[PDB]
Amino acid sequence: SMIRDTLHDLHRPLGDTGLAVSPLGLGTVKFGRTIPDDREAADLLALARDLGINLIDTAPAYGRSEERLGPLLRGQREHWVIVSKVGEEFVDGQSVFDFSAAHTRRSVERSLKRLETDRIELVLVHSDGNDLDILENSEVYPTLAALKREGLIGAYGLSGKTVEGGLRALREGDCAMVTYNLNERAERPVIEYAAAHAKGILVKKALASGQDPVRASFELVFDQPGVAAAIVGTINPLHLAHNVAMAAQALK
Amino acid sequence: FQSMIRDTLHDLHRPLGDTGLAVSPLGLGTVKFGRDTIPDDREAADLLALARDLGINLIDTAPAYGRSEERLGPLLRGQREHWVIVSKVGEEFVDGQSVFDFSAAHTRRSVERSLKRLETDRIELVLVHSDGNDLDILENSEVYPTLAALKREGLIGAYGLSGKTVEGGLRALREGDCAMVTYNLNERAERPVIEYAAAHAKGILVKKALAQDPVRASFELVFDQPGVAAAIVGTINPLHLAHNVAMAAQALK
């Protein structure tokens, strides 16, 4: 219990989705692609939970993250708001992208199966950078809309890289995951827009290259009232506990 | 899940000059046990317990640190043997302010009181608690020969200076065993004292080390000097303690 500061009383709505999330979410890239032992992974989830985190982020592109998480979340699935993605696939050395309706449908079914559940709270488009083109000219977004209607997903959105893309994702979608940190502020307009219209924002890569550095990052991020949560990947339980502490303090 | 305490200092112990004492490269400062948000007997016991499990065996105190000494005796009951204790003589703090007395009478009185407060038959290291006028105190007061005598008598294991000046640190090392010095990213003036000690197998403790993780940057500076045996860091935050240990371990690869 060198862990007095937790996030239990700091949960926040993710726009108008009706979902309530901790201001930190556990990133999960490293579960699939030094990888944690099943044991190490279970302890990390257990610790996240006791620190008041209920948000977890994954993706088909993150190696076997999805595959491993299903079993790991058995018995506790209900606690967790799961975020996953569609469109980036990772075959051989490299990233393969497919934003067709067929593949969107195939990926989300496979994600439900891998995660041993009947629904995922949020599914975001896994952009290659060309956000606006994908949103306007591919089938992915209307397919996600359909999957939302059918109950397979609770909400949908974009994990984008451009401001033009983040704004458009929010016109009909529910949430934009954006990059925002001490070194990159270009996507700030997307956050400010979301705040004006009760829309979801998740920040990815809140901590980056270059008076605690994590606190400085979180003080920047949570100074923007649009942000619901920051997704931080970590396999170091001491870093997790520290990150939680700094988030709690930044939100006084 | 509470094996979030992977990096420890157990295999990183180092000699404190030629005293024969072996110390962890971090020592637990103890001002906050005795002065001013002060830890609850419970909180204090858990901090010592945690330090120990992180491989720390060095603890620093002083009569001037309010009730630190007084509290530590009971707190260390049953584990005294694990700890290399550092304490001080000469600064007294009687009311609003510091009072200094470097006489032989007071030196002797303080050390006996320290042994009594700490419930022990000796102290590993006792340092002169300078007001800044290091060289004058060492040359023209009774404190240093008294400490030498107390060392002969077995009441202390080694002696030295908690100084502020380079001239004073150098002289403390001519006949004494150890110099505690300020060395951090912002203050480097006492570096000669460290370099001299390194040349002659003499003890160096760094105080106020903290002042791209900032603690790691500080420790990378401090342990880049081969003369340094340990840095004394004060903390009552167990998460900070654990982090500090991790950074030390890493800086010493």
Residues 6+ apart with CB under 8 A from B51: B28, B59, B241
DSSP secondary structure string for all residues of chain A: ------SGGG-EE-TTSS-EE-SEEEE-GGGT-----HHHHHHHHHHHHHTT--EEE--TTSTTHHHHHHHHHTTTGGG-EEEEEESB--BTTB--B---HHHHHHHHHHHHHHTTSS-BSEEEEE--S-HHHHHHHSSHHHHHHHHHHTTSBS-EEEE-S-HHHHHHHHHHSSEEEEE-BTTB-TTHHHHHHHHHTT-EEEEE--S-----HHHHHHHHHTTSTT--EEEEE---HHHHHHHHHHHHHHT-
Domains of chain A and CATH, by start: 1-252 (3.20.20.100)
How far, in Å, are A18, A123, B215 from residue A174 at the CA level? 11, 10, 41
Residue A203 pairs in a beta bridge with: A178, A230
| Buried/exposed code over B206-242 (b: 16+ C-beta within 10 A; e: otherwise) | bbbbbeeeebbebbbbbbeeebbbbbbbbbbebbbbb
Separation CA B235–CA B242 (nearest Å): 10
Neighboring chain B residues of A242 at a CB cutoff of 8 Å: 239, 243
DSSP secondary structure string for all residues of chain B: --------STT--EE-TTSS-EE-SEEEE-HHHH------HHHHHHHHHHHHHTT--EEE--TTSTTHHHHHHHHHTTTGGG-EEEEEESB---SSS--B---HHHHHHHHHHHHHHTTSS-BSEEEEE--S-HHHHHHHSSHHHHHHHHHHTTSBS-EEEE-S-HHHHHHHHHHSSEEEEE-BTTB-TTHHHHHHHHHTT-EEEEE------HHHHHHHHHHHSTT--EEEEE---HHHHHHHHHHHHHHT-
Residue A13 pairs in a beta bridge with: A20
How far, in Å, are A17, A122, A176, A191, B26 from residue A170 at the CA level? 12, 14, 7, 10, 52
How far, in Å, are A87, B111, B132, B152, B233 from residue B128 at the CA level? 69, 11, 11, 17, 19
Separation CA A58–CA B74 (nearest Å): 51
Separation CA B28–CA B60 (nearest Å): 6
Technique of determination:
X-ray
Taking the Cβ of residue A46 and every Cβ of chain B, the question of whether any pair is shorter than 8 Å is answered with yes
- Tokens 């709690």 sit on residue: A248
| Buried/exposed code over B95-120 (b: 16+ C-beta within 10 A; e: otherwise) | eeeeebbbeeebbbebbeebbebbeb
For B229, phi and psi rounded to 5 degrees?
-90, -45
- Residue B211: CA atoms inside 13 Å, Cβ hemisphere, count? 15
**Of the candidates B99, B76, B72, B164, the residue with the CA atom closest to the CA atom of residue B127:** B164
Separation CA B62–CA B91 (nearest Å): 8
For A20, phi and psi rounded to 5 degrees?
-115, 125
Counted residue by residue, chain A has a size of 252
- Tokens 């606190």 sit on residue: A215
Residue B203 pairs in a beta bridge with: B178
B88 belongs to an annotated ligand binding site: no
Which site among B2, B3, B4, B186 would you substitute to test the A interface, given the most A Cβ atoms closer than 10 Å to its Cβ?
Answer: B4
Dig out the tokens for A123 from the structure.
């599914």
Instruction: Indicate left, alpha or beta for B181 from its phi (over 0: left) and psi (-120 to 50: alpha).
Output: beta
Q: Which residue of A has its CA nearest to B242?
A: A238
Chain B segment 66-125 residues within 8 A of A by beta carbon are none
Separation CA A105–CA A112 (nearest Å): 11
Neighboring chain A residues of B243 at a CB cutoff of 8 Å: 238, 242
Dig out the tokens for B70 from the structure.
């007084």
For A32, phi and psi rounded to 5 degrees?
-120, -30
Under an 8 A CB cutoff, do A2 and B214 touch?
no
Separation CA B59–CA B82 (nearest Å): 10
Return the residues preceding each gap in chain B, C–N over 2.5 A, or none.
Answer: 36, 211
Taking the Cβ of residue A3 and every Cβ of chain B, the question of whether any pair is shorter than 8 Å is answered with yes
Beta-carbon count within 10 A of B137 CB: 24
Separation CA A239–CA A136 (nearest Å): 40
**Of the candidates B113, B149, B144, B151, the residue with the CA atom closest to the CA atom of residue B129:** B144
User: Measured in whole angstroms, how far is the alpha carbon of residue B56 from the centre of its chain?
Assistant: 12
Under an 8 A CB cutoff, do A237 and B4 touch?
yes
User: Measured in whole angstroms, how far is the alpha carbon of residue B66 from the centre of its chain?
Assistant: 16
Separation CA B150–CA B107 (nearest Å): 9
How far, in Å, are A2, A4, B100 from residue B239 at the CA level? 6, 10, 36
How far, in Å, are A24, B47, B227 from residue B11 at the CA level? 35, 21, 18
How far, in Å, are A56, A70, A93, A141, B217 from residue A65 at the CA level? 11, 9, 18, 23, 34
Gap between the terminal Cα atoms of chain B: 25
Residues 6+ apart with CB under 8 A from B49: none
How far, in Å, are A18, A123, A126, B45 from residue A197 at the CA level? 15, 20, 23, 52
Residue A251 pairs in a beta bridge with: none
Residues 6+ apart with CB under 8 A from A211: B214
> Pairing relation of β-strands B203-207 and B178-182?
parallel
| Buried/exposed code over A107-126 (b: 16+ C-beta within 10 A; e: otherwise) | bbeebbebbebeebbbbbbb
What one-letter code names the amino acid at B167? Answer: E
Residues 6+ apart with CB under 8 A from B191: B183, B225
Residue B162, class by beta-carbon neighbours within 10 Å (0-12 exposed, 13-18 middle, 19+ buried)? buried
How far, in Å, are A82, B61, B162, B163 from residue B178 at the CA level? 58, 16, 9, 11
Residues 6+ apart with CB under 8 A from B234: B28, B29, B30, B31, B32
B87, B52 in Cβ contact below 8 A?
Answer: no
**Of the candidates B5, B1, B2, B243, the residue with the CA atom closest to the CA atom of residue A40:** B1
Which of A210, A211, A238 lies at the smallest CB-CB distance from B4? A238
Which of B3, B238, B246 lies at the smallest CB-CB distance from A2? B238
Beta-carbon count within 10 A of A39 CB: 9
**Of the candidates A1, A9, A77, A14, the residue with the CA atom closest to the CA atom of residue A45:** A77
> Cα angle at B121 between B117 and B124, to 5 degrees?
90
User: Measured in whole angstroms, how far is the alpha carbon of residue B201 from the centre of its chain?
Assistant: 18
B13 belongs to an annotated ligand binding site: no
Q: How many CB pairs under 8 A join A and B?
A: 33
Gap between the terminal Cα atoms of chain A: 21
Taking the Cβ of residue B5 and every Cβ of chain A, the question of whether any pair is shorter than 8 Å is answered with yes
Separation CA A42–CA A36 (nearest Å): 9
What one-letter code names the amino acid at B186? Answer: N
Under an 8 A CB cutoff, do A238 and B1 touch?
no
**Of the candidates A70, A73, A75, A125, the residue with the CA atom closest to the CA atom of residue A100:** A125
From B37's Cα to the closest Cα of chain A, the distance in A is: 16
Separation CA A49–CA B96 (nearest Å): 48
B37 belongs to an annotated ligand binding site: no
> Cα angle at A163 between A157 and A168, to 5 degrees?
45
Dig out the tokens for A224 from the structure.
């923007």
Contacts of residues B74-82 at CB distance under 8 Å and 24 or more positions apart, as own/partner, are: B74/B119, B75/B41, B75/B44, B75/B45, B75/B48, B76/B48, B76/B118, B76/B119, B76/B120, B77/B119, B79/B48, B79/B52, B80/B118, B80/B119, B80/B120, B82/B52, B82/B57
Taking the Cβ of residue B195 and every Cβ of chain A, the question of whether any pair is shorter than 8 Å is answered with no
Residue A195, class by beta-carbon neighbours within 10 Å (0-12 exposed, 13-18 middle, 19+ buried)? middle
Residues 6+ apart with CB under 8 A from A22: A7, A10, A11, A12, A52, A53, A54, A55, A229
From B204's Cα to the closest Cα of chain A, the distance in A is: 28
From A234's Cα to the closest Cα of chain B, the distance in A is: 12
B249, B8 in Cβ contact below 8 A?
Answer: yes
Active site residues of B: 65
Taking the Cβ of residue B175 and every Cβ of chain A, the question of whether any pair is shorter than 8 Å is answered with no
B116 belongs to an annotated ligand binding site: no
From B34's Cα to the closest Cα of chain A, the distance in A is: 22
From B198's Cα to the closest Cα of chain A, the distance in A is: 32
Residues 6+ apart with CB under 8 A from A228: A12, A13, A14, A15, A21, A23, A200, A201, A202
Taking the Cβ of residue B216 and every Cβ of chain A, the question of whether any pair is shorter than 8 Å is answered with no
